[PDB]
Amino acid sequence: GMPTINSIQTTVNGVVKIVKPFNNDIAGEQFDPHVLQTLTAFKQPAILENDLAALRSGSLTPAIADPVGDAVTVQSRNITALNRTVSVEWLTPQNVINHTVLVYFHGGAFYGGVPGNNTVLLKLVAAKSHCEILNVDYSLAPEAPAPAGILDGLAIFQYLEQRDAETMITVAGDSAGANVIMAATNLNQQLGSNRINQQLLLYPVTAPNADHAGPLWDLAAFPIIDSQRAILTNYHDLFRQLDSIMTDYYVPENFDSHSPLISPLHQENFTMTPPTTIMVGEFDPFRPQAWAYAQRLAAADTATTFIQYQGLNHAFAPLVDQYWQSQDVAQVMAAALI
Amino acid sequence: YFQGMPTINSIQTTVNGVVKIVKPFNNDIAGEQFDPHVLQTLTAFKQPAILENDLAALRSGSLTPAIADPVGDAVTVQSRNITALNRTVSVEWLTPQNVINHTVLVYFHGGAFYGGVPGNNTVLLKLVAAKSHCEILNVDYSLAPEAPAPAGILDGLAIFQYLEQRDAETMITVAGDSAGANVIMAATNLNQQLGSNRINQQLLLYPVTAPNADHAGPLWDLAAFPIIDSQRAILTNYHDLFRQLDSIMTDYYVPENFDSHSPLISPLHQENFTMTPPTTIMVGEFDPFRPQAWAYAQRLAAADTATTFIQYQGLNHAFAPLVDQYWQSQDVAQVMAAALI
């Protein structure tokens, strides 16, 4: 049972902006109470240690309650293209429609995470939209740093395009997975493929290791009530630390994080970029760079929708058994596919 | 730790010197029902379970299916043999990228004395290594009935000697789950009786402290597990399965010349607990072995040994390796890592 929320839709700089409050009494500037109860640790500041294994040990989401069950089949398979073998968690709903497929890259700061972290979210989407979904186990840094994950995405696309000449691909992902999928999409387009007709981006990293004293990383953009301000500061500060650490893992010495294929925000042209829906929390430290990305698309005359979830932080979407806003994301995506 | 998980409000009390930490499965429910994630795995227990009493089936049922591994190559996993006391014992050796000196973790997997493999808890241990920067011996110890008691025990002894002769400064933490915990506890006891003091800690995950205890006695009384009416049948059937399993496994473990009530088969029945190292026990509310674990913790505390007893509400037996299934499993990893640094 989901709430009846009065969202606010405006158009800012060509971007369709949809702001969804966490309830009908509070319009912004505080955490959703469900979220807040998870942030207790952020009463104190955190020092991110910077070792691979410790970082990875926090990137495993325990099984999310699964209401879909047998109505969607989840199986592993390997696909091969461009001399790359990439493992995918393949989701198949009942009564599959053709010529629409969703490719999804999980988050995990380029070095971690597992596709299982968002299986249940994707089962919701496949069940509603009757579309098959590729939940991809893409290459991870630093063992397989950039552009390994990108090339995996390219192989997946080639595979899909050669399998069927009529199937339309929607690319999606959360956080750093979205970043990688966006680059792969760019690369796919620069080779002449037009089969990717849509991006669904959940709080994407669009500018890894951006200036932490610049406007993309400025706490002044996150007004919040006094009692939650220390928590917000420490929370934002943790991600500031992560942003540096993760980009170091992702980018090898020969490459640079400010390049277009590492930072989609810095692409020189956005005219080939497909129609895009971005979903992100009010208090996600990556929110500003997501918004900057959206503005860039709209200015290039690409249809762009930016849904902001008030009171929400980073990485919330797969937690469909915790937040109505997660179920909402599931709905938005499904709707985008049918 | 990282991201989405509501803070659990645990309850710490001291009972007869035991530091008791009760961790509810959410902030709504305090006790007396299964955590729903556990509950959905217990459907078959609406009816009495059928145990196939043959070695091949029992062994097969002691093998955990693949668990998702978020660590990958960031912790090194090697097979090595060590030899001591004229025993060669295989170990899965876990090495993190920056290793702290001296502190080392020896772990014995569960599997009812006749079964299990170190691979059952590899991911759990990679988590522990990753957080603690400690090297870990995940030991392939002797299994019954081909190598019944005290073969596993002696394998433990051999490991300790290997480690202590390797360097004199190294501190050992012994750990294991279920029957694995039992065997490594006895080996620790033995190691101490020979005069070693290098083992400075036990981390026990739902240990079997008294194999084949009286099933009509207080350690096996269903009354000790209050639960809601809707889940009573399941609990009862689940508990009965383990009662039967307890008899069978002890039979395999204990050869005819020995006895299960002895101190080295049943650490609960040690005559003395004063050499016993500081200990942390982690066990589920609905683990059939919970009461015997509690009895052990009390004997420790009474011997003025620091004892912590973490009870995870709504959890059953053998949950810990399942780190992709239960937040409590990752919590166990965290508690262990904390105890090592």
Side-chain angles (χ1 to χ4, degrees):
Chain A
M2 285 183 64
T4 301
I5 254 69
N6 306 126
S7 54
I8 305 176
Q9 185 177 318
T10 68
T11 295
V12 178
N13 288 325
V15 178
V16 177
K17 187 189 176 194
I18 300 175
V19 172
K20 304 196 173 187
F22 61 77
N23 69 36
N24 287 320
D25 297 320
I26 293 145
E29 307 190 2
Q30 70 184 87
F31 287 116
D32 181 294
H34 302 88
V35 173
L36 182 65
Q37 78 196 2
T38 78
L39 298 176
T40 281
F42 292 92
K43 293 199 149 184
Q44 314 296 321
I47 308 93
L48 214 49
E49 191 185 6
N50 188 14
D51 79 269
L52 223 209
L55 290 169
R56 288 182 175 163
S57 70
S59 66
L60 176 62
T61 309
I64 286 130
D66 178 3
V68 178
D70 297 335
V72 175
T73 285
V74 177
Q75 282 291 328
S76 274
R77 37 189 295 210
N78 290 322
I79 78 95
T80 305
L82 304 180
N83 245 267
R84 304 185 73 75
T85 296
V86 23
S87 156
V88 348
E89 185 174 91
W90 206 289
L91 282 67
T92 319
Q94 304 166 338
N95 299 294
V96 227
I97 70 166
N98 316 328
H99 307 333
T100 304
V101 69
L102 177 76
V103 187
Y104 188 97
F105 279 28
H106 69 86
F110 302 114
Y111 59 74
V114 297
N117 288 339
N118 47 259
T119 304
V120 175
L121 174 74
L122 296 181
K123 295 181 75 172
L124 258 347
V125 177
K128 286 142 178 287
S129 71
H130 301 271
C131 281
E132 55 185 10
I133 303 174
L134 282 73
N135 187 17
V136 181
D137 194 17
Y138 67 94
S139 289
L140 294 185
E143 297 93 334
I150 294 170
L151 296 177
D152 287 354
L154 218 227
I156 300 300
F157 303 150
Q158 184 171 101
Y159 172 85
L160 292 173
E161 299 166 321
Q162 286 176 8
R163 186 170 82 145
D164 169 36
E166 285 165 300
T167 301
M168 294 305 105
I169 304 170
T170 297
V171 296
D174 71 269
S175 171
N179 174 282
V180 177
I181 237 295
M182 291 160 72
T185 299
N186 184 5
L187 190 53
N188 198 234
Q189 300 177 322
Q190 291 178 54
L191 283 159
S193 162
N194 300 123
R195 299 276 294 278
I196 302 175
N197 61 346
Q198 187 172 213
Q199 305 191 132
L200 303 178
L201 312 170
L202 313 185
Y203 39 85
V205 179
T206 69
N209 192 35
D211 184 345
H212 294 152
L216 264 21
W217 277 97
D218 166 29
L219 274 158
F222 298 90
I224 206 178
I225 52 166
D226 302 89
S227 70
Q228 298 168 4
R229 191 171 296 142
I231 289 170
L232 176 66
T233 300
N234 293 327
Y235 182 77
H236 191 267
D237 176 68
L238 183 59
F239 280 88
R240 195 270 307 168
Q241 293 174 59
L242 176 70
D243 187 39
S244 292
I245 285 162
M246 79 193 196
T247 304
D248 206 86
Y249 283 127
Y250 185 48
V251 185
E253 281 287 358
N254 55 304
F255 292 141
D256 192 271
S257 69
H258 298 328
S259 71
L261 282 173
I262 308 297
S263 297
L265 185 61
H266 301 325
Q267 288 179 205
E268 208 119 25
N269 221 273
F270 291 91
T271 48
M272 239 35 263
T273 310
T276 293
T277 303
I278 292 165
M279 289 141 282
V280 57
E282 175 178 14
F283 298 110
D284 191 313
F286 301 99
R287 178 183 55 91
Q289 63 185 266
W291 176 256
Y293 181 76
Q295 287 208 356
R296 248 94 145 170
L297 301 198
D301 229 52
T302 287
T304 310
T305 296
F306 185 99
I307 304 173
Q308 171 168 319
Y309 293 94
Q310 300 294 74
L312 269 288
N313 59 340
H314 192 62
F316 73 92
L319 311 182
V320 294
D321 61 352
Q322 279 183 236
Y323 305 119
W324 69 261
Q325 299 93 334
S326 301
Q327 297 168 265
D328 189 62
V329 162
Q331 281 172 334
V332 173
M333 288 167 82
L337 297 172
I338 75 174
Chain B
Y1 157 78
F2 234 99
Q3 334 244 37
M5 224 287 288
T7 294
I8 262 53
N9 303 333
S10 53
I11 304 181
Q12 177 168 310
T13 60
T14 299
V15 186
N16 298 316
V18 178
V19 181
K20 180 182 188 192
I21 303 176
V22 173
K23 306 195 173 191
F25 68 71
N26 66 33
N27 303 309
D28 300 319
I29 289 92
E32 304 186 15
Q33 60 182 278
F34 284 110
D35 179 302
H37 298 271
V38 173
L39 185 58
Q40 48 86 24
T41 80
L42 293 182
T43 299
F45 286 92
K46 292 181 165 169
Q47 298 306 311
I50 304 174
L51 191 46
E52 296 161 58
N53 191 3
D54 76 275
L55 193 54
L58 289 168
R59 286 204 163 130
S60 190
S62 77
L63 262 34
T64 307
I67 302 163
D69 176 1
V71 171
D73 295 330
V75 170
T76 302
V77 176
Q78 287 275 355
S79 267
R80 322 232 256 257
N81 296 318
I82 68 96
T83 296
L85 310 178
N86 264 303
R87 300 187 68 86
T88 299
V89 12
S90 299
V91 353
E92 174 174 88
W93 210 291
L94 290 87
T95 313
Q97 290 163 352
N98 268 274
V99 184
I100 62 155
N101 298 324
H102 309 147
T103 314
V104 56
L105 175 64
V106 183
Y107 192 98
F108 276 34
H109 67 81
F113 301 111
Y114 54 74
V117 297
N120 275 3
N121 45 259
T122 298
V123 179
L124 170 68
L125 296 182
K126 290 171 84 169
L127 262 43
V128 175
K131 296 169 180 297
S132 75
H133 296 276
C134 291
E135 68 176 343
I136 300 170
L137 284 77
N138 194 17
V139 184
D140 200 14
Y141 65 94
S142 291
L143 300 181
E146 301 90 347
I153 296 172
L154 297 180
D155 288 353
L157 228 217
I159 299 300
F160 302 150
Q161 174 168 115
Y162 170 80
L163 293 175
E164 301 172 34
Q165 286 180 3
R166 183 174 75 150
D167 88 80
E169 304 287 291
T170 259
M171 290 304 117
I172 303 168
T173 292
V174 294
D177 65 271
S178 185
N182 171 289
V183 177
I184 208 174
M185 288 156 76
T188 295
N189 180 5
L190 195 58
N191 197 233
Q192 296 174 332
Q193 290 184 55
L194 285 159
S196 167
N197 58 15
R198 296 276 294 276
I199 302 177
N200 74 340
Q201 187 171 223
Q202 303 184 136
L203 302 175
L204 308 174
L205 314 184
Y206 35 92
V208 175
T209 61
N212 201 39
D214 178 8
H215 292 149
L219 270 15
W220 278 96
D221 194 347
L222 253 186
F225 301 86
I227 201 169
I228 63 186
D229 299 342
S230 57
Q231 296 172 8
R232 178 160 296 106
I234 284 167
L235 174 70
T236 303
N237 291 329
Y238 180 75
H239 197 260
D240 282 330
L241 175 66
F242 280 83
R243 200 152 49 77
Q244 177 181 4
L245 179 60
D246 182 30
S247 285
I248 293 167
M249 70 183 198
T250 300
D251 230 273
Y252 277 123
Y253 187 50
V254 179
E256 284 299 295
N257 47 314
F258 292 142
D259 190 277
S260 69
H261 195 264
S262 72
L264 281 172
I265 305 307
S266 293
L268 184 60
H269 302 327
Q270 290 175 215
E271 198 90 346
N272 152 80
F273 295 88
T274 59
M275 284 190 300
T276 305
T279 293
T280 302
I281 295 155
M282 285 146 282
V283 60
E285 172 178 14
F286 298 106
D287 194 316
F289 296 103
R290 172 180 56 76
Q292 73 186 253
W294 177 250
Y296 178 82
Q298 285 209 99
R299 277 161 169 90
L300 289 215
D304 215 38
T305 292
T307 312
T308 295
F309 188 90
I310 307 168
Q311 183 170 321
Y312 293 94
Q313 298 300 71
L315 266 291
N316 60 348
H317 187 75
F319 67 92
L322 312 177
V323 296
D324 58 0
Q325 290 179 50
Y326 306 115
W327 73 256
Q328 297 88 337
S329 308
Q330 295 193 28
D331 194 54
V332 163
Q334 179 55 58
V335 167
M336 292 177 73
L340 294 165
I341 69 182

PDB file of all heavy atoms in Angstrom, chain A residues 147-173:
ATOM      1  N   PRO A 147      38.889   1.107 -19.068  1.00  0.00           N
ATOM      2  CA  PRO A 147      37.476   1.071 -19.446  1.00  0.00           C
ATOM      3  C   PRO A 147      36.884  -0.341 -19.508  1.00  0.00           C
ATOM      4  O   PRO A 147      36.022  -0.588 -20.352  1.00  0.00           O
ATOM      5  CB  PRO A 147      37.523   1.637 -20.861  1.00  0.00           C
ATOM      6  CG  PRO A 147      38.808   1.026 -21.415  1.00  0.00           C
ATOM      7  CD  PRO A 147      39.758   0.876 -20.237  1.00  0.00           C
ATOM      8  N   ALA A 148      37.325  -1.250 -18.643  1.00  0.00           N
ATOM      9  CA  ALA A 148      36.849  -2.643 -18.690  1.00  0.00           C
ATOM     10  C   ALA A 148      35.316  -2.788 -18.577  1.00  0.00           C
ATOM     11  O   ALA A 148      34.678  -3.489 -19.378  1.00  0.00           O
ATOM     12  CB  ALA A 148      37.546  -3.482 -17.637  1.00  0.00           C
ATOM     13  N   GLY A 149      34.735  -2.131 -17.577  1.00  0.00           N
ATOM     14  CA  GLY A 149      33.293  -2.138 -17.406  1.00  0.00           C
ATOM     15  C   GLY A 149      32.583  -1.545 -18.612  1.00  0.00           C
ATOM     16  O   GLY A 149      31.571  -2.093 -19.075  1.00  0.00           O
ATOM     17  N   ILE A 150      33.107  -0.425 -19.116  1.00  0.00           N
ATOM     18  CA  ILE A 150      32.579   0.196 -20.326  1.00  0.00           C
ATOM     19  C   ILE A 150      32.533  -0.815 -21.477  1.00  0.00           C
ATOM     20  O   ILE A 150      31.505  -0.962 -22.140  1.00  0.00           O
ATOM     21  CB  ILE A 150      33.428   1.421 -20.739  1.00  0.00           C
ATOM     22  CG1 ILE A 150      33.301   2.529 -19.694  1.00  0.00           C
ATOM     23  CG2 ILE A 150      33.024   1.953 -22.107  1.00  0.00           C
ATOM     24  CD1 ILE A 150      34.299   3.699 -19.882  1.00  0.00           C
ATOM     25  N   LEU A 151      33.641  -1.519 -21.701  1.00  0.00           N
ATOM     26  CA  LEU A 151      33.722  -2.463 -22.808  1.00  0.00           C
ATOM     27  C   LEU A 151      32.765  -3.645 -22.627  1.00  0.00           C
ATOM     28  O   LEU A 151      32.230  -4.180 -23.611  1.00  0.00           O
ATOM     29  CB  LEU A 151      35.167  -2.931 -23.017  1.00  0.00           C
ATOM     30  CG  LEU A 151      36.151  -1.831 -23.435  1.00  0.00           C
ATOM     31  CD1 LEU A 151      37.565  -2.379 -23.555  1.00  0.00           C
ATOM     32  CD2 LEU A 151      35.719  -1.148 -24.739  1.00  0.00           C
ATOM     33  N   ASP A 152      32.544  -4.041 -21.373  1.00  0.00           N
ATOM     34  CA  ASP A 152      31.543  -5.056 -21.068  1.00  0.00           C
ATOM     35  C   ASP A 152      30.171  -4.599 -21.539  1.00  0.00           C
ATOM     36  O   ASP A 152      29.427  -5.375 -22.140  1.00  0.00           O
ATOM     37  CB  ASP A 152      31.491  -5.338 -19.566  1.00  0.00           C
ATOM     38  CG  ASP A 152      32.680  -6.134 -19.079  1.00  0.00           C
ATOM     39  OD1 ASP A 152      33.510  -6.574 -19.916  1.00  0.00           O
ATOM     40  OD2 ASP A 152      32.768  -6.336 -17.848  1.00  0.00           O
ATOM     41  N   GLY A 153      29.843  -3.341 -21.260  1.00  0.00           N
ATOM     42  CA  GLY A 153      28.573  -2.779 -21.670  1.00  0.00           C
ATOM     43  C   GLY A 153      28.455  -2.811 -23.177  1.00  0.00           C
ATOM     44  O   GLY A 153      27.398  -3.177 -23.715  1.00  0.00           O
ATOM     45  N   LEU A 154      29.542  -2.447 -23.860  1.00  0.00           N
ATOM     46  CA  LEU A 154      29.559  -2.436 -25.322  1.00  0.00           C
ATOM     47  C   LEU A 154      29.299  -3.844 -25.882  1.00  0.00           C
ATOM     48  O   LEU A 154      28.561  -4.012 -26.855  1.00  0.00           O
ATOM     49  CB  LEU A 154      30.899  -1.915 -25.838  1.00  0.00           C
ATOM     50  CG  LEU A 154      30.970  -1.022 -27.086  1.00  0.00           C
ATOM     51  CD1 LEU A 154      32.046  -1.496 -28.053  1.00  0.00           C
ATOM     52  CD2 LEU A 154      29.639  -0.830 -27.812  1.00  0.00           C
ATOM     53  N   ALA A 155      29.900  -4.852 -25.259  1.00  0.00           N
ATOM     54  CA  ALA A 155      29.703  -6.231 -25.695  1.00  0.00           C
ATOM     55  C   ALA A 155      28.248  -6.637 -25.524  1.00  0.00           C
ATOM     56  O   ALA A 155      27.666  -7.274 -26.408  1.00  0.00           O
ATOM     57  CB  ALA A 155      30.619  -7.176 -24.923  1.00  0.00           C
ATOM     58  N   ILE A 156      27.666  -6.281 -24.383  1.00  0.00           N
ATOM     59  CA  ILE A 156      26.272  -6.609 -24.125  1.00  0.00           C
ATOM     60  C   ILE A 156      25.390  -6.017 -25.225  1.00  0.00           C
ATOM     61  O   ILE A 156      24.527  -6.714 -25.775  1.00  0.00           O
ATOM     62  CB  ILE A 156      25.793  -6.099 -22.746  1.00  0.00           C
ATOM     63  CG1 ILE A 156      26.615  -6.714 -21.611  1.00  0.00           C
ATOM     64  CG2 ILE A 156      24.323  -6.400 -22.540  1.00  0.00           C
ATOM     65  CD1 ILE A 156      26.542  -8.209 -21.555  1.00  0.00           C
ATOM     66  N   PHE A 157      25.609  -4.741 -25.544  1.00  0.00           N
ATOM     67  CA  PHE A 157      24.826  -4.076 -26.585  1.00  0.00           C
ATOM     68  C   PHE A 157      24.971  -4.785 -27.926  1.00  0.00           C
ATOM     69  O   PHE A 157      23.967  -5.091 -28.571  1.00  0.00           O
ATOM     70  CB  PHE A 157      25.215  -2.601 -26.732  1.00  0.00           C
ATOM     71  CG  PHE A 157      25.085  -1.805 -25.470  1.00  0.00           C
ATOM     72  CD1 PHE A 157      25.925  -0.724 -25.235  1.00  0.00           C
ATOM     73  CD2 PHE A 157      24.132  -2.134 -24.515  1.00  0.00           C
ATOM     74  CE1 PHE A 157      25.824   0.019 -24.069  1.00  0.00           C
ATOM     75  CE2 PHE A 157      24.024  -1.387 -23.349  1.00  0.00           C
ATOM     76  CZ  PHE A 157      24.880  -0.309 -23.132  1.00  0.00           C
ATOM     77  N   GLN A 158      26.213  -5.051 -28.340  1.00  0.00           N
ATOM     78  CA  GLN A 158      26.458  -5.749 -29.600  1.00  0.00           C
ATOM     79  C   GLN A 158      25.712  -7.071 -29.636  1.00  0.00           C
ATOM     80  O   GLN A 158      25.014  -7.371 -30.611  1.00  0.00           O
ATOM     81  CB  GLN A 158      27.942  -6.003 -29.839  1.00  0.00           C
ATOM     82  CG  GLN A 158      28.187  -6.651 -31.199  1.00  0.00           C
ATOM     83  CD  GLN A 158      29.651  -6.729 -31.573  1.00  0.00           C
ATOM     84  OE1 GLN A 158      30.274  -7.778 -31.444  1.00  0.00           O
ATOM     85  NE2 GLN A 158      30.201  -5.625 -32.058  1.00  0.00           N
ATOM     86  N   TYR A 159      25.857  -7.848 -28.566  1.00  0.00           N
ATOM     87  CA  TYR A 159      25.116  -9.089 -28.431  1.00  0.00           C
ATOM     88  C   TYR A 159      23.613  -8.867 -28.655  1.00  0.00           C
ATOM     89  O   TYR A 159      22.983  -9.575 -29.446  1.00  0.00           O
ATOM     90  CB  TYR A 159      25.374  -9.742 -27.065  1.00  0.00           C
ATOM     91  CG  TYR A 159      24.477 -10.925 -26.799  1.00  0.00           C
ATOM     92  CD1 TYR A 159      24.813 -12.192 -27.261  1.00  0.00           C
ATOM     93  CD2 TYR A 159      23.272 -10.772 -26.109  1.00  0.00           C
ATOM     94  CE1 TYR A 159      23.972 -13.286 -27.040  1.00  0.00           C
ATOM     95  CE2 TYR A 159      22.430 -11.852 -25.882  1.00  0.00           C
ATOM     96  CZ  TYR A 159      22.783 -13.105 -26.350  1.00  0.00           C
ATOM     97  OH  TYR A 159      21.946 -14.172 -26.116  1.00  0.00           O
ATOM     98  N   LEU A 160      23.041  -7.884 -27.969  1.00  0.00           N
ATOM     99  CA  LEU A 160      21.610  -7.649 -28.095  1.00  0.00           C
ATOM    100  C   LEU A 160      21.227  -7.210 -29.497  1.00  0.00           C
ATOM    101  O   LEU A 160      20.198  -7.639 -30.022  1.00  0.00           O
ATOM    102  CB  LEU A 160      21.121  -6.613 -27.085  1.00  0.00           C
ATOM    103  CG  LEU A 160      21.177  -7.054 -25.631  1.00  0.00           C
ATOM    104  CD1 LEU A 160      20.831  -5.879 -24.738  1.00  0.00           C
ATOM    105  CD2 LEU A 160      20.250  -8.249 -25.394  1.00  0.00           C
ATOM    106  N   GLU A 161      22.051  -6.355 -30.096  1.00  0.00           N
ATOM    107  CA  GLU A 161      21.743  -5.801 -31.407  1.00  0.00           C
ATOM    108  C   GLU A 161      21.847  -6.879 -32.502  1.00  0.00           C
ATOM    109  O   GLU A 161      21.088  -6.870 -33.470  1.00  0.00           O
ATOM    110  CB  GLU A 161      22.646  -4.595 -31.700  1.00  0.00           C
ATOM    111  CG  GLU A 161      22.474  -3.437 -30.705  1.00  0.00           C
ATOM    112  CD  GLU A 161      23.586  -2.380 -30.768  1.00  0.00           C
ATOM    113  OE1 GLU A 161      24.790  -2.714 -30.935  1.00  0.00           O
ATOM    114  OE2 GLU A 161      23.244  -1.194 -30.621  1.00  0.00           O
ATOM    115  N   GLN A 162      22.766  -7.819 -32.330  1.00  0.00           N
ATOM    116  CA  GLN A 162      22.968  -8.862 -33.326  1.00  0.00           C
ATOM    117  C   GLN A 162      21.986 -10.002 -33.147  1.00  0.00           C
ATOM    118  O   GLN A 162      21.673 -10.712 -34.096  1.00  0.00           O
ATOM    119  CB  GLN A 162      24.412  -9.365 -33.300  1.00  0.00           C
ATOM    120  CG  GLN A 162      25.389  -8.365 -33.916  1.00  0.00           C
ATOM    121  CD  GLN A 162      26.842  -8.818 -33.809  1.00  0.00           C
ATOM    122  OE1 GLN A 162      27.130  -9.962 -33.411  1.00  0.00           O
ATOM    123  NE2 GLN A 162      27.770  -7.917 -34.156  1.00  0.00           N
ATOM    124  N   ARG A 163      21.499 -10.160 -31.923  1.00  0.00           N
ATOM    125  CA  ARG A 163      20.510 -11.177 -31.590  1.00  0.00           C
ATOM    126  C   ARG A 163      19.219 -10.873 -32.329  1.00  0.00           C
ATOM    127  O   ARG A 163      18.558 -11.762 -32.869  1.00  0.00           O
ATOM    128  CB  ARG A 163      20.256 -11.147 -30.087  1.00  0.00           C
ATOM    129  CG  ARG A 163      19.353 -12.237 -29.573  1.00  0.00           C
ATOM    130  CD  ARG A 163      19.349 -12.264 -28.051  1.00  0.00           C
ATOM    131  NE  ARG A 163      18.442 -11.268 -27.497  1.00  0.00           N
ATOM    132  CZ  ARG A 163      17.723 -11.445 -26.390  1.00  0.00           C
ATOM    133  NH1 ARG A 163      17.820 -12.580 -25.699  1.00  0.00           N
ATOM    134  NH2 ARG A 163      16.907 -10.485 -25.973  1.00  0.00           N
ATOM    135  N   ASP A 164      18.877  -9.593 -32.362  1.00  0.00           N
ATOM    136  CA  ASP A 164      17.632  -9.150 -32.955  1.00  0.00           C
ATOM    137  C   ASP A 164      17.803  -7.729 -33.465  1.00  0.00           C
ATOM    138  O   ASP A 164      18.256  -6.859 -32.733  1.00  0.00           O
ATOM    139  CB  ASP A 164      16.520  -9.192 -31.912  1.00  0.00           C
ATOM    140  CG  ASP A 164      15.271  -8.490 -32.381  1.00  0.00           C
ATOM    141  OD1 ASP A 164      14.949  -8.569 -33.589  1.00  0.00           O
ATOM    142  OD2 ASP A 164      14.612  -7.845 -31.545  1.00  0.00           O
ATOM    143  N   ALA A 165      17.424  -7.486 -34.712  1.00  0.00           N
ATOM    144  CA  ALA A 165      17.591  -6.159 -35.297  1.00  0.00           C
ATOM    145  C   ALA A 165      16.495  -5.160 -34.902  1.00  0.00           C
ATOM    146  O   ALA A 165      16.583  -3.982 -35.240  1.00  0.00           O
ATOM    147  CB  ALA A 165      17.698  -6.259 -36.816  1.00  0.00           C
ATOM    148  N   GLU A 166      15.472  -5.622 -34.189  1.00  0.00           N
ATOM    149  CA  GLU A 166      14.325  -4.772 -33.868  1.00  0.00           C
ATOM    150  C   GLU A 166      14.204  -4.377 -32.384  1.00  0.00           C
ATOM    151  O   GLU A 166      13.378  -3.534 -32.022  1.00  0.00           O
ATOM    152  CB  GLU A 166      13.028  -5.442 -34.330  1.00  0.00           C
ATOM    153  CG  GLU A 166      12.778  -5.391 -35.837  1.00  0.00           C
ATOM    154  CD  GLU A 166      11.688  -6.363 -36.279  1.00  0.00           C
ATOM    155  OE1 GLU A 166      11.853  -7.586 -36.057  1.00  0.00           O
ATOM    156  OE2 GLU A 166      10.671  -5.906 -36.848  1.00  0.00           O
ATOM    157  N   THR A 167      15.018  -4.985 -31.529  1.00  0.00           N
ATOM    158  CA  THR A 167      14.892  -4.766 -30.088  1.00  0.00           C
ATOM    159  C   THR A 167      15.466  -3.428 -29.633  1.00  0.00           C
ATOM    160  O   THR A 167      16.580  -3.057 -29.994  1.00  0.00           O
ATOM    161  CB  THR A 167      15.500  -5.925 -29.244  1.00  0.00           C
ATOM    162  OG1 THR A 167      14.847  -7.156 -29.575  1.00  0.00           O
ATOM    163  CG2 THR A 167      15.310  -5.671 -27.763  1.00  0.00           C
ATOM    164  N   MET A 168      14.677  -2.716 -28.833  1.00  0.00           N
ATOM    165  CA  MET A 168      15.051  -1.420 -28.315  1.00  0.00           C
ATOM    166  C   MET A 168      15.626  -1.556 -26.915  1.00  0.00           C
ATOM    167  O   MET A 168      15.023  -2.182 -26.033  1.00  0.00           O
ATOM    168  CB  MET A 168      13.828  -0.506 -28.294  1.00  0.00           C
ATOM    169  CG  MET A 168      13.283  -0.168 -29.685  1.00  0.00           C
ATOM    170  SD  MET A 168      14.688   0.614 -30.802  1.00  0.00           S
ATOM    171  CE  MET A 168      15.044  -0.912 -31.945  1.00  0.00           C
ATOM    172  N   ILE A 169      16.797  -0.966 -26.709  1.00  0.00           N
ATOM    173  CA  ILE A 169      17.481  -1.074 -25.434  1.00  0.00           C
ATOM    174  C   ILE A 169      17.302   0.178 -24.573  1.00  0.00           C
ATOM    175  O   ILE A 169      17.622   1.299 -25.006  1.00  0.00           O
ATOM    176  CB  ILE A 169      18.988  -1.297 -25.647  1.00  0.00           C
ATOM    177  CG1 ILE A 169      19.224  -2.535 -26.516  1.00  0.00           C
ATOM    178  CG2 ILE A 169      19.709  -1.379 -24.307  1.00  0.00           C
ATOM    179  CD1 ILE A 169      20.662  -2.715 -26.978  1.00  0.00           C
ATOM    180  N   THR A 170      16.785  -0.015 -23.360  1.00  0.00           N
ATOM    181  CA  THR A 170      16.883   1.010 -22.329  1.00  0.00           C
ATOM    182  C   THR A 170      18.049   0.676 -21.406  1.00  0.00           C
ATOM    183  O   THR A 170      18.107  -0.423 -20.832  1.00  0.00           O
ATOM    184  CB  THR A 170      15.624   1.099 -21.483  1.00  0.00           C
ATOM    185  OG1 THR A 170      14.529   1.497 -22.309  1.00  0.00           O
ATOM    186  CG2 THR A 170      15.802   2.128 -20.375  1.00  0.00           C
ATOM    187  N   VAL A 171      18.984   1.617 -21.267  1.00  0.00           N
ATOM    188  CA  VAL A 171      20.083   1.439 -20.323  1.00  0.00           C
ATOM    189  C   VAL A 171      19.721   2.061 -18.993  1.00  0.00           C
ATOM    190  O   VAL A 171      19.034   3.090 -18.937  1.00  0.00           O
ATOM    191  CB  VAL A 171      21.425   2.018 -20.826  1.00  0.00           C
ATOM    192  CG1 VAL A 171      21.890   1.276 -22.068  1.00  0.00           C
ATOM    193  CG2 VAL A 171      21.328   3.528 -21.070  1.00  0.00           C
ATOM    194  N   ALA A 172      20.168   1.415 -17.920  1.00  0.00           N
ATOM    195  CA  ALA A 172      19.903   1.890 -16.561  1.00  0.00           C
ATOM    196  C   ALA A 172      20.995   1.453 -15.611  1.00  0.00           C
ATOM    197  O   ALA A 172      21.836   0.597 -15.940  1.00  0.00           O
ATOM    198  CB  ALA A 172      18.532   1.406 -16.054  1.00  0.00           C
ATOM    199  N   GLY A 173      20.960   2.023 -14.415  1.00  0.00           N
ATOM    200  CA  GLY A 173      21.931   1.692 -13.392  1.00  0.00           C
ATOM    201  C   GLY A 173      21.801   2.648 -12.224  1.00  0.00           C
ATOM    202  O   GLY A 173      21.114   3.675 -12.324  1.00  0.00           O
TER     203      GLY A 173
END
